[PDB]
């Protein structure tokens, strides 16, 4: 049951039962850590880092290998963004929809989807302000949105 859509699908990932690191992978935890560091210094989100490590380096689950997940690894070395990934992508999508709405006035579909996107933004921002990730004065505005991107 999607939160803003009437559809409901089962597409997700099924992690295996074995949490052990397989014996064919010769990489150590530290080597994966500098791989994460160099993949983060070029400007990648933790999800992109995990996808790249899974597809080419054989790192099936980095938190099973290193013991920490990617965001905590990046926050330990200070290579973490001041705003999290999903809120950033929702804000970027809202900026794109607002730009399209400014150039195209009679798109009421775009207005509806913009209201849905910014409702997502406010829910996620409220959650992050609860957990002390964002400052308690953080506020998403229409006109000062692209300055955050």
């Amino acid at each position: 049951g999607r939160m803003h859509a009437p559809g409901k699908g089962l597409s997700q990932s099924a992690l295996p039962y074995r949490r052990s690191v397989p014996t064919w992978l010769k990489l150590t935890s530290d080597d994966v850590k500098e791989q994460i560091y160099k993949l983060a210094k070029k400007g990648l989100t933790p999800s992109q880092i995990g996808v790249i490590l899974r597809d080419s380096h054989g790192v099936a689950q980095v938190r099973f290998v290193t013991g920490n997940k990617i965001l905590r690894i990046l926050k330990s070395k200070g290579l973490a963004p001041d705003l999290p990934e999903d809120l950033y992508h929702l804000i970027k999508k809202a900026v794109a929809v607002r730009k399209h709405l400014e150039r195209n006035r009679k798109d009421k579909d775009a207005k509806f989807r913009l209201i849905l996107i910014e409702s997502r933004i406010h829910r996620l921002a409220r959650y992050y302000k609860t957990k002390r990730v964002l400052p308690p004065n953080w506020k998403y505005e229409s006109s000062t949105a692209s300055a955050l991107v």
Binding site: G1, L15, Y17, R19
Partner: protein, 129 residues
């Protein structure tokens, strides 16, 4: 969304027993569900059950016996004294000879007779006959 996993477990057990099945699979598992099933089990209602351990919330496979008429949950968990227990008994049980109101009390999850034995009231969870 899925609220009250014990309600789902009891509803699935009741629906499978109505259909005359010999085994039922209930997911997810929890401590309260296993305690409730043990309370039924020591009274001879659901035989014996397996707990399947994934790294998620578990699953349970229960071997039905045909002895169950109805197992039921009470939501919300009302607060039951030791003087309101008779009123609950007449409301929920079919007779004074069989059936089980289940409480959770500070001495554990147990039934109404042993709650009256231990001189403790608690919260209502279910009934089975």
């Amino acid at each position: 969304v899925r609220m009250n996993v014990l309600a789902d477990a009891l509803k699935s057990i009741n629906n499978a027993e109505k259909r005359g099945k010999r085994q039922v699979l209930i997911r997810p598992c929890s401590k309260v569900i296993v305690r409730f099933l043990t309370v039924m089990m020591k009274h001879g209602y659901i035989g014996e059950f397996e707990i399947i351990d994934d790294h998620r919330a578990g699953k349970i496979v229960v071997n039905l016996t045909g002895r169950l008429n109805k197992c039921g949950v009470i939501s919300p968990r009302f607060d039951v004294q030791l003087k309101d227990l008779e009123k609950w008994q007449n409301n929920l049980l079919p007779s004074r000879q069989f059936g089980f109101i289940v409480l959770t009390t500070s001495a554990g999850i147990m039934d109404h007779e042993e709650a009256r034995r231990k001189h403790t009231g608690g919260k209502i969870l279910g009934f089975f006959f």
